[PDB]
Amino acid sequence: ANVVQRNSPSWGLSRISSKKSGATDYVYDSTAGEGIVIYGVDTGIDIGHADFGGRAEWGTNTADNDDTDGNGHGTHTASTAAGSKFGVAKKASVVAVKVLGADGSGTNSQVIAGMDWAVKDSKSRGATGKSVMNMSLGGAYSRAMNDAAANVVRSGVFLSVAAGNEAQDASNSSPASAPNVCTIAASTNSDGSASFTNFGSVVDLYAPGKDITAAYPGGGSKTLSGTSMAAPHVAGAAAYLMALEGTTTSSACARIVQDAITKISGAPKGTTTKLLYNGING
Template sequence: MGVFRFISISLAAVSAANAAQILSMPHAQTVPNSYIVMMKDDTSDDDFNHHQSWLQSTHTHNITRRATVQNAGMRHKYNFHKMKGYSGVFDDETIKDIAKDPKVMFVEPDTIISVHGKVDQNNVPSWGLARISSSKPGTQDYTYDSSAGEGITVYSVDTGVDINHEDFEGRAIWGSNQVNDGDDNDRSGHGTHTSGTMVGKEFGIAKKAKLVAVKVLGNDGSGPTSGIVAGINWCVEHARQNGGTNKAVMNMSLGGGSSSALNRAAAQAVEQGMFLSVAAGNDNTDARSSSPASEPSVCTVGASAEDDSRSSFSNWGPSLDLFAPGSNIISARPGGGSQSMSGTSMAAPHVAGLAAYLMALEGISGGAVCDRLKQLGSASISDVGPGTPTNVLINNGGAKGDGKSPKPSPKPSHPSEPQQPTEPQQPAPGEPSTPAPAPMPPTPQHPHTPFPGGDDFDFDGFWKKYFGGEHWRKMFSSFFN
């Protein structure tokens, strides 16, 4: 009897020593009794299924005995690549039991994630598109290759999207609603705006890419981390079945406190070949305190203003990879027309759209895209913030100088006017820089990015984009100079 008691105590001690960590989130807004559970990488499908069966039995027993949590149990299940896990509402005793399973990596309280703030301002000029195809600020023209993201799918992980907005030309579809509110619409306007910047005919960068709306935030612009992780899981699985993850881009203009679960999910998506653009946050603080912006494998984006300074609200720090236009950005709004918003939420979709554009144009994918964006960008941003390793502003590599190929920027629709976005104009290559009075086709007819008519050939820019080797550059430079 004494030997049996000793063995029992020893096993209990070993179990306690090997118990998974139950993380604390002291500075975050948590969802009462809601948790995210992540399994270890070596957990097999059989192990995971066995754990779920055990969980259902254990949780039912604990709830029946104490009846402390209502409408409880597992809500989301995650299973993609190496990541297995789930979320749900459980009482304290069940959480302690879960943590004792040696296959559990960690348990994290479910927290609230929000859009990264927004500032609305009417009647301001739109400048973001022009800036990413020019070498200097102050231009109003956007030069781009006619491939325009064709063949790439962009996932908007946000508040939903008005997929019927005229700017999407029927290229947007509804994907998934992880909010489970029964409302497959964008009541906030945030997701429609960010999506317009990515793929819109008027306001967008990848004007031929497809868009999939994945709603993870409610009408108030917030939602639980567990639903966002589920949204990432859904995107990866959908991309696998529809063209492949190497032809997929995910934009996440959202964030909250540091979350190991959210960072892990984002990293798994990147490892599967997707490109993730993530807003750095709008608190004028170190982005390392925010998820998923603090995940090293994603492309974390700070916001820039029209004068090429860091936007005053933009987060900074070692996590940042790039800057993109984020102040007073005009894009689509639900129901038609346009509106202006500011935030790193507006900067990230510039990067996502440009990523889709380059993936179609150059055939690159995944983590290589962020590196390519850094190569093409210009060291333009001032006052980047403490510890920020980059001052690179994104550029599509399609123009030099002041980008003379005319494409007047659209202005936001006035609330009292009919909700129709201003039709921008796009000339054929070589036409004069004066905007024509009638709308032109939305993309140049030349199969590659045109250099504005009348400019000298930009040999250095051409060589950097298509070859890059210094030895070959010197050997062949005489042919161009």
């Protein structure tokens, strides 16, 4: 049944349930992603934060010996994907995979080790075909990183990836350029293409990415910008559609692209103008 979150605290939530910009309420089916696991591959998650309501658990830490989010990005992106107040899929389960340190850096091998851990965990949980991974990090082109990302998807885990923030073609970035991932560019509240977003033919769609408010370690909230903020909207929408329509991980990017509306103004040439839409027809 339809649930309405009135005056939602981040414009990105109300945008994705509306065909037109300027909406204030977020409208979604009560299934709300329940029973879907989302792996947050990032700086860690403040799993005690009220916004997760006990649905966040600690998976692994390949970066250091401190099992907390000392940066903030990992909590913020998990919150956009699945937080009660700030999130898309408000009943999904969330698993922290900490692969970056408190300063937001980590080596490719630490990231890949976290991705590998998550694939194993999803098999052990029986979540193959109904699992989601969010990667709001990116770097220079790397065949090894692209192989690892492709393996995640081939193993039955949907993978949403930030396109990057260097205002360039995302084909020069990994894992944005990897086979079969869902690569997400950042939009603004006026439906423009954010000035920093990477673009090009590897981008599958846009999602809200500028001035996105979500949870921050220690119980408050923070407003941030980047394609890092855009990707978890799509991670949450995938979990939502899996629990609602039963779409599988291998088809979820294509289904999101099919539902998306051609709303972006002034998208760079050769770049889709499709914007995330949850299909609610409110």
